[PDB]
Amino acid sequence: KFQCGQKTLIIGGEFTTIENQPWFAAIYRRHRGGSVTYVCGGSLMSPCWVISATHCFIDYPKKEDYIVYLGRSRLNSNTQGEMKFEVENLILHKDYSADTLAHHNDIALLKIRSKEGRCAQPSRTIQTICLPSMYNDPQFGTSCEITGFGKENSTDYLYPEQLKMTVVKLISHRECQQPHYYGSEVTTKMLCAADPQWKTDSCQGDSGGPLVCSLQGRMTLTGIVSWGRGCALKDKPGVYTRVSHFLPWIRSHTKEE
């Protein structure tokens, strides 16, 4: 059975396997076709719920178009033990908003289900992540994990075939709001996270994926990759949806209603 956050023992710097990030959900879109093409990262919540970012689904809002993979560490080929699902519920945040850079309320939920009507089942390669609880977040300077199939340099037209991960250090809301950084583009419903350093970061294609921090033991879904200016630029960290600010929203949409 599922025990959230525990493994079986990106400009960024590291290729990985899925047992290193076993809650990582890889979200694709059925075409013509087909001709499934990668869309966004995600994270497993409970056996029937994946959480991602709304900006991912905004241009193709049809749930019946989507495919979620769990236990997958390759962009375009299969992984022993990978599990394939369809989306029978796609919920976007109704207060979502963007300008040319920043996304506000950048959070989405997908209720998953397989061709044989099954929810997700635990394994060495598939595992839930823990939610934060109301109000507590990691404090700044905490080193956290980001995982994704995103671009390896911002100018690339190609994406990596092997899942990448990196570590990034949480920046204070107040430092992120400095003119040289983001100013008021960043809100208290977002978290900034960068490298000291500026050599590792999230990028195009990493959207929706996990920002994982360890709180009080548990490995917890603290952030969802959302946006940033360029990739691994100085004074321009990555910006993440603050998942804690949204538990009423998750709970209101996940439990029954």
Ligand X SMILES: NC(N)=Nc1ncc(Cl)c2ccc(S(=O)(=O)N3CCC[C@@H]3C(=O)O)cc12
CB of 13 to ligand X, least distance (A): 15
CB of 143 to ligand X, least distance (A): 16
CA angle 190, 10, 51 (to 5 degrees): 50
CB of 111 to ligand X, least distance (A): 23
Q: Which is nearer to ligand X, 49 or 227 (CB)?
A: 227
DSSP 89-148: EEEE-TT-EE-SS-EES--EEEEEE-TTS------SS----BPPPSS--PPTT-EEEEEE
Q: Side chain identity at 227, as an amino acid letter?
A: W
Nearest to ligand X by Cβ — which residue?
Answer: 228
CB of 114 to ligand X, least distance (A): 28
Encoded tokens for 110: 């997908």
Binding site for ligand X (CB under 6 A): 101, 154, 201-204, 206-207, 225, 227-231, 236, 238
Is 55 annotated in the active site? yes
Q: Which is nearer to ligand X, 125 or 207 (CB)?
A: 207
Encoded tokens for 195: 């490298």
CB of 11 to ligand X, least distance (A): 8
Pairwise CA distance, residues 44 & 22, whole Å: 9
Which residue in the list 52, 65, 104, 106 is annotated as catalytic? 106
DSSP 58-75: TT---GGGEEEEES--BS
Which residue in the list 43, 52, 202, 207 is annotated as catalytic? 207
Q: Which is nearer to ligand X, 56 or 87 (CB)?
A: 56
> Is residue 173 within a helix (H) or strand (E), and if so which, with residue range?
helix 173-176
CB of 220 to ligand X, least distance (A): 20
Which residue in the list 43, 52, 55, 226 is annotated as catalytic? 55
User: Peptide bond before 197: cis, by omega within 30 degrees of 0?
Assistant: yes
Encoded tokens for 106: 């950048």
Pairwise CA distance, residues 211 & 219, whole Å: 10
Pairwise CA distance, residues 24 & 145, whole Å: 12
Q: Which is nearer to ligand X, 63 or 229 (CB)?
A: 229
Q: Which is nearer to ligand X, 131 or 203 (CB)?
A: 203
Pairwise CA distance, residues 126 & 1, whole Å: 11
Is 201 annotated in the active site? no
Is 106 annotated in the active site? yes
Q: Which is nearer to ligand X, 163 or 203 (CB)?
A: 203
Provide the annotated active-site residues.
Answer: 55, 106, 207
